[PDB]
Design a protein around this ligand. Structure first.
Ligand SMILES: Cc1[nH]nc2ccc(-c3cncc(OC[C@@H](N)CC(C)C)c3)cc12
Length: 349
């Protein structure tokens, strides 16, 4: 139990449970796996399914999370309908139910997220062959969503889980050290609480800050392309170990974009209602100030992050660069991404 830090606290609205409790004479609670804003993810034995080990997402008894859960359930039912064998790499839902105001969703049990493995491993970047396979599966799973009129909107390393996050301590002679390496790079995409059908109401602000597309920031409307932007940032992150856009501020974010990617298109600058960020038709950002120095020193043009001159590394950056195109309509689609030369070192299953 932790200390509450404000009136509106994240600790409020959870279902109280203790290890060993059974929910609905069915789900025996084995351990707590994580806590997000929505509630908790718990490991359970499902006793009405041969004792299968499952992940149970127990949602807070708070209306906004209860609403998000209903939308997620609807999205997962679509996923199950269109992908009965659970082949398109989005997490499989088994069952859902209302427990005294707390929505509960049952999923296949999975390992640590691609973020948490990275974090626990000292942010040591994934080797490129792992980046390739992880990125490929990510593009497959989200392409499936894009084919069925869906946009995830909150893609990030925390929402990409290893099927099994077991690792090997392999010997690295170059550094005279031992290093952790995940044995299997099979992944699933999770958390569909923000996933939006083409025809549904679009929230103005979507995505976690680091993964947010420029059309979202400038409020130009967003659809599937904003997922591709997120994927571009995620892939970069797998390759170097740190976020591409380390910021929490629109103006700074947009400045970092310009520094990493070049000037924002005029069409977007003139169209946006966020005129506050612009002066005389260009980003209102003084590079010569202390704020400007920070951006100049802590990020650089995208390609300069290459840690090797080998063609397969350049191919990776061709991929990222195409995903981080400013204009959503010019940005690489996920169907195009799967045909990209970077992935070639894989043969169809
Ligand atoms: C371990 C595991 N096994 N199977 C799972 C199926 C689904 C989920 C999941 C569902 N919705 C949201 C999620 O958030 C991930 C991250 N954003 C916040 C964490 C602190 C929980 C994860 C986890 C699963």
């Amino acid at each position: 139990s932790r200390r509450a830090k404000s009136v509106e606290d994240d600790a409020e609205g959870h279902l109280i449970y203790h290890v060993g409790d059974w929910l609905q004479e069915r789900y025996e609670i084995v351990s707590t796996l994580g806590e997000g804003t929505f509630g908790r993810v718990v490991q359970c034995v499902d006793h009405r399914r041969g004792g299968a080990r499952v992940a149970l997402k127990i949602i807070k008894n708070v209306e906004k999370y209860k609403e998000a859960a209903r939308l997620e359930i609807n999205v997962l039912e679509k996923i199950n309908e269109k992908d009965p064998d659970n082949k398109n790499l989005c997490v499989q839902m088994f069952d859902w139910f209302d427990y005294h105001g707390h929505m509960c969703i049952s999923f296949e049990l999975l390992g640590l997220s691609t973020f948490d493995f990275l974090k626990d491993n000292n942010y040591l970047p994934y080797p490129i062959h792992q980046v390739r396979h992880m990125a490929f599966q990510l593009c497959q799973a989200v392409k499936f969503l894009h084919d069925n009129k869906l946009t995830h909107t909150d893609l990030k390393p925390e929402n990409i889980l290893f099927v099994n996050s077991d690792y090997e301590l392999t010997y690295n002679l170059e550094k005279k050290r031992d290093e952790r390496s995940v044995k299997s790079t099979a992944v699933r995409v999770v958390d569909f609480g923000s996933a939006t059908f083409d025809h549904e109401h679009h929230s103005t602000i979507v995505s976690t800050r680091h993964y947010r597309a420029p059309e979202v920031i400038l409020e130009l409307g967003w659809s599937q392309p904003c997922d591709v932007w997120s994927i571009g940032c995620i892939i970069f992150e797998y390759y170097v170990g740190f976020t591409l856009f380390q910021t929490h501020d629109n103006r700074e974010h947009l400045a970092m974009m310009e520094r990493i990617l070049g000037p924002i298109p005029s069409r977007m600058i003139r169209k946006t209602r966020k005129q506050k960020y612009f002066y005389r038709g260009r980003l209102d950002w003084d590079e010569n100030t202390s704020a400007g120095r920070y951006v100049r020193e802590n990020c650089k043009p995208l390609r300069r992050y290459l840690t090797s001159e080998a063609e397969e590394h350049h191919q990776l950056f061709d991929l990222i660069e195409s995903m981080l195109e400013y204009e959503p309509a010019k940005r690489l689609t996920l169907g195009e991404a799967l045909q990209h030369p970077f992935f070639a070192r894989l043969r169809a299953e």
